[PDB]
Write a protein that binds this ligand. Structure first.
Ligand code: HEM
Ligand code: HEM
Lengths: 700, 700
């Protein structure tokens, strides 16, 4: 197509996803308000589905719970803390490439089995919520006291183009190959939270397919941590997950047809279909391993650790489909799981390399032991972890809807109280104006408070005013000395008024922008919404926030250190997380530059003889051919006058890409037109507002 | 990215281009009304630019006309009749990949030279119009009486993803290579109108770089015909084009930097920049050939045929950059073009292989002779052809705006008169209802009248009611016997009322749809706009309309013959030309199917026990897993009941792709929800309306 030609080019399309032309819903359609009308006592239908076997994909022992829990687990298992991408918050498993990953084999059947319910509840039940709820109801039906559930996940209509899944151009390849995601000594390429392409967290047969429970344990600890789970939550999840259901590998795999995206139309959007021989029931082949972890896989119990992983000794075996798996030595007949179609036949137990790791790894072993001797703890830790798994990308509790939302404020939700809304905004502004804070100090501070937001998992943002807290107040990119000079003033204004520090930091930014538009002879009142609360250090997980540190921010031409990634690459990624379009990214850069907001007070792209005045000067000058651009070191250029051959300004790649990239320059040219001065200001303001209000889910 | 994984998948993204998130203009912005306010006497600024040389890319002999004419010519030269794609109607040359094609080398300089003007006139002058106007004003300034010009081309903001430019994964490769666009004996892959990738029409040095004017003449005739130009227009264009300007090839090419999309940010979005040595002025290297076709290249004259191509004899030479070119034998000094920087130095004349073809090809030679002995004719034929070149993708004259629009109605515009608007719509409807025409006969006829439309060059559509004319009335896909049974009735209703046959065919379709919604117990009045005119056979070019023949239409599950292209591929291409989104394509297919509109009255995807009733039955049944799909021959499937193993319905790939493609099935599922019956009807209607009104540029 139009570009395999220049693969180094910015993938600007990630900024224009989920737009009008792909969305089939009317423009006033609002899911939050339609799901609030849902008859959640739909729990009866979902629970009934569990024992409502369909011929084209029969339920094991007449119960789909194991399958449904795996569905939800896999929908959730794609999340990663580095950027908050992946997760069950958008129902992405119904689209490429996730619907066709090897690890999601046969989950297409699970999703399809949920369709009658989606058809019944319609627009009030998104595929995203349904897929995320399925496993929870399954657990309920099988005996587990779940912790809770919240609806509120809006559906998407095409693949999430912004997610980089890994460097491999092959499915589940060895870690000792070209295009490997591994470096040094088994050091996982940073963003990634899986050991290979097409897998959720870890290889069930062992690292690169070679069984050792100790090396497998290392991958499990690493990948789960990258998904926000610690040792306890991990052992809990693994055991709790395998307490029900089984592994399917009773047949030749090579006989499975193409994964969904590669199957032809006769397959109804399904995949991995066996047409050579029976591929359903006891003849089902999924992961390739075969057997169940517990005697009673249709029910919550203590069978996982209870004579199985801890009380029997295990040895390596090969299943019918050629996969490595662990089986018990001399198991008693009563402990053998029965056949999925005929209860009078006995089959075998199993443990994957990840299950054996729970017994062999010294640290997991201690936790395994606690859950073995204290099942009440196990069930509580698992239930909570199951809930965290399914909501870790839901964002603020304000987004949670439904009768079963837990009253408890969990730390991973980034709890923030409602701030006072009755306080007279204008008095707050006058006191801000009346302080000796520069237009520049006002804007940078507000920018920094809001820039932490990312729509991937909805964490960050200006609401709870955390920047004032550790570790944020000390982040290099946040300019710690200038930040307190400003917090000191603003904290005083808030105590003196009834407005929150969070509301004040934003309102101050708004003042800086208002002062700058006024200096260019433009009068404007920037929209504003009170209500931000101030969050406490107690409800702020210092370790989980490390991931939101601004190590890079092109919007303030700041780069903490030399990075592999191009500066505009970094710019593009922050703007995608922020939820901004290319036109929005463009005006923002042009505006912030003339407001004199660079980190370190650098003039890298000021291009104005009048900083502090909101003009379209950045574009007018960037687009002026009377100048030539001379590379001048690392991420730096000299903007020279062609006549005098003298250096007029300096600039970085973040600045110049807006005058190099054909699409961005087209935007730059527009804003540099003689007739678009007011449009630039109006558009800068709207984008500014969008950023300050991005995390405002507390609003209606 | 998200899919090199399944390259056979529908490129649905081509249906969601140019959306809100990429458009930087407010949503109420309307170019047609802003350009109507333009001070077209901007002709003075454009004309002044011609002699306003800029240091970073100096004008040859102090005149940019040759360069500007080439700019416009190349912007226009990308058009092709097979699908109407390409052309100067969107200003696509400012974006990838066209901005970086080898043939467009240094046109980046031309575009950049026009920026001060675009900056001055702003939102009232699109880049598309400016680029298309540049060459016309250049010709005016150099002495040619141009035929006219119309503004009205709206700007785009990213590459036109829908255009397939060719199969090559390399630039300008030989025709005797893998991935070649040539088959049998030099038979150009059909859609394409160029001999290789990255070139506009033909190779200037000869077929695959080997000079012979006779084989070159064959490519010129073939490519220009694919661009709607006959022998006369072609000789005219070639000679008229080369009557001014020159070829640039005075240097080592290998020294040129990367084309624009491959250049780094310091190049200001420009490309082919020489940093090793001087690459401007007389040292400029573009095509690689060097010399001018006429003694006086800054002026319109009769020098092209006048002692140059006809009166001097020519021989093969090699220019400084190693390109083949023809030079004259023993030219007199006065006929030598002077140096571009210093008038006191003489340089050389040249003729490309395409110019020599005008002298050597027997047929071109006769036309060349007429233009040599009758320059008034030459100038008139060229002027008209220059105008056709720059407007052949503008569509109906209704779209033309400006003081210089020619009063003459040119045949290639598909002229259609204004039809009467005062006639009482309801009386027309009652008479239609009162006829014995089936709901099916009404809908299919209207569909067929409107389906010919394509937004690529804005030709086709229900307005002028041509379907009633040759060759349309006899096209197989239009079902000639059923079409006249319906025209006979409808032609009578129109004569009896004051409404046009065109308005009547559409209104009839609207009645069929209204009758079908009524049968499903839904009352609706479909929007309607009177005014369509009936076009005459005299103003209808039977040969130019061949290209709009519906050889395929998935919307009515019709395929004239087995084709290389997948049926859904064909479906996707018609819907892109029609201007429809994926959600729109989806409801349309579902609706037309239950209305019983298949070509040949086939039941391939009816899936209703009630044809003629507008229900969401197609989706409800397509999405029902109680059925399995069994391939059953060419483009056919048997929809079988899983319990009884009996054939319930049949269907084609066009039907089943909506239940296979993950994105389309998501749409299908939505419309199959219990709560979306009315949404389906409302959405089907809106899409129906959009199609019936697509060519209505005559409306405000
Ligand atoms: C700790 C890393 C894990 C590994 C290596 C792993 C591996 C596997 C494998 C190979 C299967 C085979 C399924 C088939 O062939 O059909 C399976 C099934 C399953 N896993 Fe895991 N798993 C892990 C974690 C979890 C977690 C954390 C849970 C959820 C809390 C879970 C829940 C399930 C369920 C419910 C099934 C049953 C599928 C069915 O019965 O159809 N797994 N797992
Ligand atoms: C008939 C097929 C044609 C071929 C093979 C051809 C080839 C070329 C080539 C190789 C150049 C070299 C320019 C450079 O190196 O800078 C050129 C220049 C030019 N051509 Fe054509 N051309 C064709 C048709 C036309 C037509 C139909 C027109 C417009 C009616 C046209 C107008 C021009 C102009 C104005 C230039 C001058 C560029 C300048 O002075 O900077 N050409 N052409």
């Amino acid at each position: 197509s139009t570009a395999e030609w220049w693969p180094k080019a910015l993938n600007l399309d990630i900024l224009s996803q989920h737009d009008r032309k792909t969305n089939p819903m009317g423009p006033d359609f609002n899911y939050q308000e339609e799901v609030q009308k849902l008859d959640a006592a739909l729990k009866q239908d979902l629970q009934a589905l569990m024992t409502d076997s369909q011929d084209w994909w029969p339920a094991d022992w007449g119960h789909y719970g194991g399958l449904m829990i795996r569905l939800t687990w896999h929908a959730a298992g794609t999340y990663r803390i580095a950027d908050g991408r992946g997760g069950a918050g958008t129902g992405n498993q119904r689209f490429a490439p996730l619907n066709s990953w090897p690890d999601n084999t046969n989950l297409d059947k699970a999703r399809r089995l949920l369709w009658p319910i989606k058809q019944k509840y319609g627009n009030k039940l998104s595929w995203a919520d349904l897929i995320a709820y399925a496993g929870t109801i399954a657990y309920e039906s099988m005996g587990l006291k779940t912790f809770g559930f919240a609806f509120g996940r809006e559906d998407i209509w095409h693949p999430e183009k912004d997610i980089y899944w890994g460097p491999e151009k092959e499915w589940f390849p060895p870690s000792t190959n070209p295009n490997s995601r591994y470096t040094g000594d088994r050091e996982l390429e940073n963003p990634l939270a899986a050991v290979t392409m097409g897998l959720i967290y870890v290889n069930p047969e062992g690292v690169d397919g070679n069984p050792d429970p100790l090396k497998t344990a290392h991958d499990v600890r690493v990948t789960f941590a990258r998904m926000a789970m610690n040792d306890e939550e991990t052992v809990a999840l693994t055991a709790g997950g395998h307490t029900v259901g089984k592994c399917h590998g009773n047949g030749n795999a090579a006989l499975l047809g193409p994964e969904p995206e590669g199957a032809d139309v006769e397959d109804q959007g399904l995949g991995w279909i066996n047409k050579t021989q029976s591929g359903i029931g006891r003849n089902a082949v999924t992961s390739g391993l075969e057997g169940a972890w517990t005697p009673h896989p249709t029910q919550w119990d203590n069978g996982y650790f209870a004579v199985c992983s801890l009380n029997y000794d295990w040895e390596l075996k090969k299943n019918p489909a050629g996969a490595w798996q662990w089986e018990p030595i001399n198991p008693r007949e009563e402990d053998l799981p029965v056949d999925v179609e005929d209860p009078s036949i006995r089959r075998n137990l199993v443990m994957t390399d990840a299950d054996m790791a729970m017994k062999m790894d010294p640290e997991y072993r201690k936790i395994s032991e606690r859950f073995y001797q204290d099942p009440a703890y196990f069930a509580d830790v698992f239930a909570r972890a199951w809930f965290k798994l399914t909501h870790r990308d839901m964002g603020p509790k304000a987004r949670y809807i439904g009768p079963d939302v837990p009253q408890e404020d969990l730390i991973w939700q980034d709890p923030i109280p409602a701030g006072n809304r009755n306080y007279d905004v204008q008095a707050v502004k006058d006191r801000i104006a009346a302080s000796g804070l520069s237009i520049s100090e006002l804007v940078s501070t507000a920018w920094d408070s809001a820039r932490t937001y990312r729509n991937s998992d909805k964490r960050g943002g200006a609401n709870g005013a955390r920047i004032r807290l550790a570790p944020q107040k000390d982040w290099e990119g946040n300019e710690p000395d200038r930040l307190p000079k400003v917090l000191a003033v603003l904290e005083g204004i808030s105590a003196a008024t009834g407005a929150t520090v969070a509301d004040v930091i934003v309102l101050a930014g708004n003042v800086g922008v208002e002062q700058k538009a006024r200096a260019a002879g433009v009068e404007i009142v920037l929209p504003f919404a009170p209500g931000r609360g101030d969050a406490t250090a107690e409800q702020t997980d210092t370790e989980s926030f490390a991931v939101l540190e601004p190590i890079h921010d092109a919007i303030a031409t700041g780069s903490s250190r030399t990075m592999r990634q191009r500066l505009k690459n970094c710019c593009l990624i922050a703007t995608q997380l922020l939820g901004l379009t290319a036109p929005e990214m463009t005006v923002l850069i042009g505006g912030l530059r003339v407001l004199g907001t660079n980190h370190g007070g650098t003039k890298h792209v000021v291009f104005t003889d009048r900083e502090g005045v909101l003009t379209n000067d950045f574009f007018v000058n960037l687009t002026d051919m009377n100048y030539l651009w001379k590379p001048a070191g690392k991420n730096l250029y000299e903007i020279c006058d062609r006549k005098t051959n003298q250096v007029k300004w300096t600039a970085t790649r973040v600045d110049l890409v807006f005058g190099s990239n054909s699409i961005l320059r087209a935007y730059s040219e527009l804003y540099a037109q003689d007739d678009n001065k007011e449009k630039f200001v109006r558009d800068f303001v709207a984008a500014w507002t969008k950023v300050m209000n991005a995390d405002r889910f507390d609003l209606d």
